[PDB]
Each structure stands twice: as structure tokens, then as C-alpha cells.
A and B are shown apart, each in its own frame.
Chain A
């Protein structure tokens, strides 16, 4: 298929 994974942002406080 059209395999795709979104990026995962870390929390902003770090």
C-alpha cells in the first residue's frame, strides 16, 4: 500500500 508514519514531536519543555 501507501505505508507512511507521521513524525513524533517530543514535548516542548525539554
Chain B
């Protein structure tokens, strides 16, 4: 049997949050703040992909270039093997060549 016997506790969500109410504020800052900032300078994330979409191979290459001088050892080796595998995949296997 997979199904649960009792229905779950009620998940109550506050739609008038602090974060939900001011979502999208200081977006659209460049257009009507005479272009002092870009809207991509509002992004808060990893230091390599802040305003950059990328592939899986391209994300790994960019992370190795911008950060891989200060990564941990096992994480750096795993990133090396991932870039090797993804090069072998994208440039040799698949349909549509």
C-alpha cells in the first residue's frame, strides 16, 4: 500500500507576506531611474552566474574558471570529471548531427 491513511495537516500560507508583497519592487529600475543600474544587478546568487543563463557544460566551465581556484579538492575533482564527461557527451553522442 502506498497511500496515506489520514489527510495531511493544513498548509497555511501567508499571501500578504513581507517577501511576497514587495516582490518585483526595484525591478524596472533602469528604465525609470535613468539607467544608473541594470536589473541584473538586483540578482543575488552565486558569484559566477549573476546575469548569465548558460548550458550545463557552460555553467560548469564558467564555475571552474571564476571560482575553481578556491574550491575544495573533492569538489574540484568532481567538476573536472563532470566537464570531461559533458564534453564527451555533447560533442560525440546524440541525435541530430
Chains A, B in direct contact (C-beta < 8 Å):
no
